[PDB]
Design brief:
PDB class: membrane protein
Largest sheet of chain A: 7 strands, mixed
Oligomer: homodimer
Entry title: Structure of a human A-type Potassium Channel Accelerating factor DPPX, a member of the dipeptidyl aminopeptidase family
Keywords: dppx, DPP6, Kv4, Kv, KAF, membrane protein
CATH superfamily of the largest domain in chain A: Dipeptidylpeptidase IV, N-terminal domain
CATH class of the largest domain in chain A: Mainly Beta
Number of strands of chain A: 39
Bound molecules: a molecule of 4 linked components (NAG-NAG-BMA-MAN), a molecule of 4 linked components (NAG-NDG-MAN-BMA), a molecule of 3 linked components (NAG-NAG-BMA), a molecule of 3 linked components (NAG-NDG-MAN), a molecule of 2 linked components (NAG-NAG)
Chains A, B: Dipeptidyl aminopeptidase-like protein 6
Helix content of chain A: 10-25%
CATH topology of the largest domain in chain A: Methanol Dehydrogenase, Chain A
Structural class of chain A: alpha+beta
CATH architecture of the largest domain in chain A: 8 Propeller
Radius of gyration of chain A: 26 Å
Strand content of chain A: 25-35%
Number of helices of chain A: 11
Strand order of the largest sheet of chain A: 33-35-34-36-37-38-39
Assembly: dimeric
Chain lengths: 723, 723
């Protein structure tokens, strides 16, 4: 009847969602970040959305990033930013006054127009720091000249203020590794030493006539990890730099610092996780002593999970709210909020959780000390959803679900409260087209809409959007969610081809009510096929027990859980056994290539064709922090790294078409994996096909490229599908 | 009716030809190298084939190579752990006495069980040398301890006695670069300096956890070439090392030494070719003076060809027989034998050729000074054949064709004469199953058979061998030969798919009556398809004019010549326009990917699918010696390297399937080419498919691998063929 979703549509200015990136500045107003060019400043109390910056950003060579100072008198702009790893704000930095006019290059002292690794504003006034060649420079006053506060930096070897590869990609999940005290007087920063970490060479084939390798420190499983230390310096006066000394538990001689936050302007909280990732230690250090005191500690049989977890302290640095796994009677433990006094005394804990049940809390948003309110997101509704809740810090702990069925057509949520909990920004993300709204904490009434994305709502309604469907299945005391997407003009007579899209990274979640549109949408819409996603054991958001089911068995269970979801889908009559395919990327590529068998024996050849994008195929060749977490430390050969090798599985492979896609200069999952895999396919005399992306990184931060990628992928399955 | 030729057959112990590798030791007997294990020693005069070595070679960890000493009292052996046998004479060597028993490791002085880069026997006695870490060691007596005669060697940078990459692959065509004087008193050796040659890094993805690149000197077009010098040392007494000084012709400031041979035990012949390869200088040097004297010189407009050409001298070092291009009236010049006195005096040449015509002489085999006989191979019969001839060095120069229709069922030939021309070994090579015979020079009578390969003759007769067919076509004053292979059970009703197999390396020859069986045979036999080969301009064995037609036009003409051969084949009715495919490897892969167009416009899409194995795609990235030879020197940008880029052609590509096969650690044609090519396929939004061979070299010296290769190739075409 009307237009099917096509790839062009995917990259259409029509289907582009616009995130206002709203951010509170006070307890009465939020930034009202770019509406579609200009940057405003809404004032919820008395609708006064002033103008802070305008389409003069386009002027500054389309500054990719920008940040208004605290005193709201300047703005920090970055342009010609080039991406490094996951997230890497690293380009040219310019400063300008709030209304408009007169930009200025932010360069270190004595150096000309040079790229910076990071800029960003301080907490108070217009203080700011910027990192150049791994050294931290500071400027209190905008006119003041920069001062090199820390100078032990050494490009690619000694990082301070920013993460090294492993810290950004695996252990800290951010490139930023420094933290200002609340009063902007002291600055805490991690100092990472990759000096003794092995160096991986990345192959190049396109640069000059004689391409050369790009080296960088990357620790494979078992090798030496980056050595880290936490430091703090004064931002006024001689600045005495002090290192925050770590605990002692002999079960913490090799560790990662996974979390650091200021409890007050004198004390800073730190979580110390040991390399084996089975022992954790929360700590309060004196930013003037360097003495850290144990404030709690956890240990697990498998591996500690969710360790970047930031605690919420009471303005007086007194008691605080953390969140961890608590037994929850039977059926593993779940993540819930917990309370402890500021000065936990050696004997026992102040232990006592605020929430409980067989559901996980996923994010503490705020603590209203003036009474008993603690806002957060949870899976209490359905693990596939995200609702905003609130509980009483006192007596009862009654949970009131603020979102739940408010602003309908969407059940996935994110939100932030004003600097007084009064109001809060609330964003959808699904199931319906995403949007941003504003409410007053108490009332819960939509004070107004910030972004509705009508463009998108229109365009979507002009297309045969796929039809969603959730069908919890189950193995053992576990129920595995699994959403199935149907062609939208789905009947029951016709038989459709099955496309299993598997991720399966332990801890992640593939079945959720978020709003997404990718090449999968195109496959369902434009080429009419049903896609199936399922979250087996190892999945997150369903308690420790489920999660840890894959310990030292990476890729074994998930093969069964996935095959079981395929089988139950094969039983239906609106799907024909002959056209079954599988796809997966990253850890998903591993599972993807792991799942190309034949169930039973007489009933062989379950899949027709499969594909893996940047597949990991040997955890011996993968990042320490990841492999060791699920298979335990290597060295003395934990011999879990042997049976998990996907090589053992390709031995089968009889008639399936195998398409491997892999960007050549992949810094996360080295092309080395794909290379080793193909070697096996060759010895095993199997048939494969490779598509390469010469000198390309792991992420695909190019609409142009991402597009080509998708097209390639759809062109593969769509082929081994039509008959 | 009976078995079709299959891949298994190809690698069957049944279809394996056995080359006795017969080699004369005197004027009455040849080695009778391995009959199928044991090594004998036939005595043609009185049938006495003694036994020199036996299946005791299998003993010595299956020595891959072996060589009996001159005094026939010892035997050199060589094996390779991690078996791979190009024949870079590198591995572990052992010495043993002629009958049998007691092997001994040949290691340098003071070093233990270590690999050697080369061994080999001297001319007289049992003298021998061996190269270790690019230094030459000498042992006169078997018991004598080695002496490091030359010690300026530096692994991978300073080679002496052996070629560096470029010298082995392109300019000398051998890894061996040393030559003993006839009397074993003086030793000449090339000293190659790659010190200032750029170093190419080869990507590795499989070795250790952290793969690393493998570096080595490789000169791309325009870069600095290896610097060479010729040296001579005495093998008895203090050994004064002397360098043979090169000429002066300012048109020889940058040169390659392409040929060196001893004229006597005091004089050595050297051919000096300049980098541009358009000026050549034959020279006689005094192995005791170092003074080289011009003895002749050639220059061409295009490029000199066949420069490794060794001259044949009269026992008294007097007059000699060379072979070069001589005008031959009209229609270019052809290669024929030439005579000159030993001491050519400055004025004019002793010039006067012995043979002439529109055919090429391809190899001087011997000179019988006792009269007037000069034996050689030629294309005088048909360029697609090789017959043994003879001519009179005196008065007439009458050519008598010794082979021609002798031992029928085969017209391709190779041969060698005893150390007195009396008898001669004669080997087939085609068209019928290969074999080795023995005749007495005068008589021409088959004294007996040395190797008949009945196994093969049997097995072949049990199979539906493809049917051969030659069909000279023509463009301009040139007739382009083109053999076509038919399915053997070929009718005329049925329509067959066309498989154009193109090589096209300038100077080479693809259409010849040699006996070959590869995946092409399987394609014709087992999958019934007709393959077509054609030799357009640039081909060899048909005079200078034809050859040089491609100068600075690499890939242009050959596209037309090839397309024309395809068209004339398309006209037939036993072939259907719908299933036309093309394949090529190396320079053939270049042409292969160059030929994926549509003739005319309305009659587009000439090919359905094509494939290129290790395709060169940019002569700027190829070996200097090769590119510069056909496109002229680079540097000041000869801008022929731009239009020849295959990139310009892939722009078309609309519906064809493109399968690129490339071994990753290819040292001859860098994977870099395939990488650059794919980048273009991506920008041009074309469809391709890559098959890689992780860490594999360029050659495929593994039956196991070679097999997988073939299978892969047949599996591709056979697919886009069946309907
Ligand atoms: C890698 O790919 C190879 C081909 O690209 C695969 O080889 C085929 O493997 C099958 C099964 O092992 C072989 O048996 C087949 O049996 C079928 C009937 O039983 C035949 O199919 C019929 O229809 C096809 C449709 O195209 C026709 O082409 C065919 O002529 C026939 O009439 C098959 O042809 C064949 O008998 C088959 O021989 C193989 N095919 C070919 C041409 O290689 C291989 O399995 C894959 N994996 C590996 C190498 O292990
Ligand atoms: C500051 O906060 C304001 C809070 O009101 C905000 O205004 C928002 O609220 C009003 C009303 O609550 C929204 O009203 C709009 O939408 C409704 C329903 O679509 C319309 O109602 C009816 O429309 C019919 C037409 O069929 C008309 O005939 C009826 O008389 C009736 O009005 C309204 O007409 C109106 O369009 C308003 O949309 C909403 N604002 C947004 C866009 O979110 C203020 O916007 C805000 N101050 C600023 C700076 O705008
Ligand atoms: C790369 O491969 C893709 C598919 O693997 C090629 O796409 C195909 O291109 C044709 C036309 O170029 C599409 O249209 C066809 O039109 C005829 C009408 O004459 C019709 O009979 C066919 O049914 C077909 O619709 C074809 O649909 C399309 N295939 C798909 C579904 O993608 C592409 O041409 C190749 N090279 C490129 C990208 O240029
Ligand atoms: C990672 O970065 C740190 C700095 O954050 C590096 O520190 C340097 O470590 C070397 C040792 O490898 C020190 O040199 C040694 O000094 C001692 C003096 O006691 C001397 O005996 C040795 O011969 C050697 O010279 C160096 O002083 C130190 N840099 C300074 C001055 O702070 C560290 O090496 C890197 N990785 C690690 C943990 O080794
Ligand atoms: C969390 O994982 C760590 C890492 O395995 C566990 O710690 C222990 O690590 C040490 C490594 O020094 C292992 O010690 C071994 O103990 C045996 C005892 O006979 C000794 O003979 C060996 O020489 C070696 O010292 C030990 O295997 C390992 N413990 C475990 C889990 O087996 C830590 O205990 C784990 N925590 C839990 C219970 O989750
Ligand atoms: C949640 O609320 C939205 C509104 O914010 C709902 O929008 C409605 O979406 C349906 C799609 O099923 C629209 O239907 C279409 O109407 C047009 C009328 O021109 C017709 O041409 C199409 O064939 C189709 O029937 C409907 O117009 C729209 N309602 C309006 C007018 O606002 C939405 O359905 C709800 N859930 C979601 C996200 O689907
Ligand atoms: C390739 O190999 C040769 C040897 O066969 C290299 O010879 C070395 O050349 C360097 C110059 O690049 C010499 O060093 C210089 O020596 C002069 C002597 O007066 C001195 O004044 C300079 O300060 C410098 O040290 C070096 O002596 C020589 N090696 C020896 C001792 O034999 C040659 O350099 C390599 N390729 C080329 C042409 O550079
Ligand atoms: C030394 O030289 C001998 C001289 O010929 C070898 O003999 C060979 O030649 C004879 C005849 O010329 C062959 O005759 C037999 O085979 C043919 C083949 O069909 C028959 O038609 C004929 O009736 C004979 O039966 C020998 O077979 C042939 N021998 C070989 C193997 O070549 C003689 O063999 C050789 N000395 C040795 C060591 O055998
Ligand atoms: C190969 O041919 C030679 C001739 O070169 C044969 O030997 C004699 O040749 C002369 C001609 O110069 C004849 O007059 C003799 O009659 C030949 N010998 C005889 C009687 O056969 C020789 O026999 C052949 N091969 C060998 C040397 O065995
Ligand atoms: C957020 O919006 C609601 C409007 O519905 C406000 O609620 C009123 O608050 C006053 C207290 O200042 C009460 O006395 C009224 O009874 C409330 N109105 C009613 C009847 O709903 C609220 O004031 C707004 N923001 C906040 C938190 O004050
Ligand atoms: C063979 O080629 C060389 C170079 O290509 C010719 O020598 C000259 O080399 C210089 C480089 O310094 C060029 O500038 C000249 O243009 C070259 N001469 C020519 C061909 O114009 C050499 O003469 C060539 N031989 C011939 C005549 O073909
Ligand atoms: C060349 O001669 C051989 C003899 O060595 C011929 O052999 C015959 O080959 C056919 C194959 O078509 C077989 O059917 C016959 O049985 C063979 N003859 C016998 C019985 O020996 C051969 O035909 C000729 N050409 C080639 C190489 O095929």
């Amino acid at each position: 009847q009307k237009k099917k979703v096509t790839v062009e549509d995917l990259f259409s200015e029509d289907f582009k969602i616009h995130d206002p990136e709203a951010k509170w500045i006070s307890d009465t107003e939020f930034i009202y970040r770019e509406q579609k060019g200009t940057v405003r400043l809404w004032n919820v109390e008395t609708n006064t959305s002033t103008v802070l910056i305008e389409g003069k950003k386009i002027e500054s060579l389309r500054a990719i990033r920008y940040e208004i100072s605290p005193d709201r008198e300047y703005a920090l702009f970055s342009y010609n930013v080039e991406p490094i790893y996951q997230h890497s704000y690293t380009g040219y930095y310019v400063l300008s006054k709030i209304p408009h006019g007169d930009p200025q290059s932010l360069d270190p002292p004595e150096v000309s127009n040079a790229k910076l690794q990071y800029a960003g504003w301080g907490p108070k006034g217009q203080q700011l720091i910027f990192i150049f060649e791994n050294n931290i420079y500071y400027c209190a006053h905008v006119g003041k000249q920069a001062i090199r506060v820390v100078s032990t930096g050494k490009e690619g070897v000694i990082y301070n203020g920013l993460s090294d590869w492993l810290y950004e990609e695996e252990i800290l999940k951010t490139h930023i590794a420094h933290w200002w005290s609340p009063d902007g007087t002291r600055l805490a920063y991690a100092a990472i030493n990759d000096s003794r970490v092995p160096i991986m060479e990345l192959p190049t084939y396109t640069g000059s006539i004689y391409p050369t390798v790009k080296p960088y420190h990357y620790p494979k499983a078992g090798s030496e990890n980056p050595s880290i230390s936490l430091h703090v310096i004064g931002l006024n006066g001689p600045t005495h730099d002090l290192e925050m000394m770590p605990p002692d538990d002999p079960r913490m001689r090799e560790y990662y610092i996974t979390m650091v936050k200021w409890a007050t302007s004198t004390k800073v909280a730190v979580t110390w996780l040991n390399r084996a990732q089975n022992v954790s230690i929360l700590t309060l250090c004196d930013a003037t002593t360097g003495v850290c005191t144990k404030k709690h500690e956890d240990e697990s049989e498998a591996w500690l999970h969710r360790q970047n977890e930031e605690p919420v302290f009471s303005k007086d640095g007194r008691k605080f709210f953390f969140i961890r796994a608590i037994p929850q009677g039977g059926r593993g433990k779940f993540y819930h909020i917990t309370v402890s006094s500021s000065q936990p005394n050696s004997s026992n804990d102040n232990i006592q959780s605020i929430t409980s049940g067989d559901w996980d809390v996923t994010k503490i948003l705020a603590y209203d000390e003036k009474g008993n309110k603690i806002y957060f997101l949870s899976t209490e509704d359905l693990p596939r959803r995200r609702q905003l809740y609130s509980a009483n810090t006192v007596g009862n702990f009654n949970r009131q679900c603020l979102s739940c069925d408010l602003v309908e057509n969407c059940t996935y949520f994110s939100a932030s409260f004003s600097h007084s909990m009064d109001f809060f920004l609330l964003k959808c993300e699904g199931p319906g087209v995403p949007m941003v709204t504003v409410h007053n904490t108490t009332d819960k009434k939509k004070m107004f809409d910030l972004e509705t994305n009508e463009h998108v709502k229109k365009a979507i309604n002009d297309r045969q959007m796929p039809k969603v469907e959730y069908r919890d299945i189950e193995i053992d005391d576990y129920n595995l969610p699994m959403q199935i997407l149907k062609p939208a003009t789905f009947t029951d007579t016709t038989h459709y081809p099955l496309l299993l899209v598997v991720d399966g990274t332990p801890g992640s979640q593939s079945v959720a009510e978020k709003f997404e549109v990718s090449w999968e949408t195109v496959m369902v819409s434009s080429h009419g096929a049903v896609v199936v996603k399922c979250d087996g054991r190892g999945s997150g958001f369903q308690g420790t027990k489920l999660l840890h089911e894959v310990r030292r068995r990476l890729g074994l269970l998930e093969e069964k859980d996935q095959m079981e979801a395929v089988r139950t889908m094969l039983k239906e009559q609106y799907i024909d056994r002959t056209r079954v395919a599988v796809f997966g990327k990253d850890y998903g590529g591993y599972l993807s290539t792991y799942i190309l068998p034949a169930k039973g024996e007489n009933q062989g050849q379950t899949f027709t064709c499969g594909s893996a994008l940047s597949p990991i195929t040997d955890f011996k060749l993968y990042a320490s922090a990841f492999s060791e977490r699920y298979l335990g430390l290597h060295g003395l050969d934990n011999r879990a790294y042997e049976m998990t090798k996907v090589a053992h599985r390709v031995s089968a492979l009889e008639e399936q078409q195998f398409l491997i896609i892999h960007p050549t200069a992949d810094e996360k999952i080295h092309f080395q994996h794909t290379a080793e895999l193909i070697t096996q396919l060759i010895r095993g005399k199997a048939n494969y096909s490779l598509q390469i992306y010469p000198d390309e990184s792991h992420y695909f931060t190019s609409s142009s490229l991402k597009q080509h990628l998708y097209r390639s992928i759809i062109n593969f399955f769509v082929e081994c599908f039509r008959i």
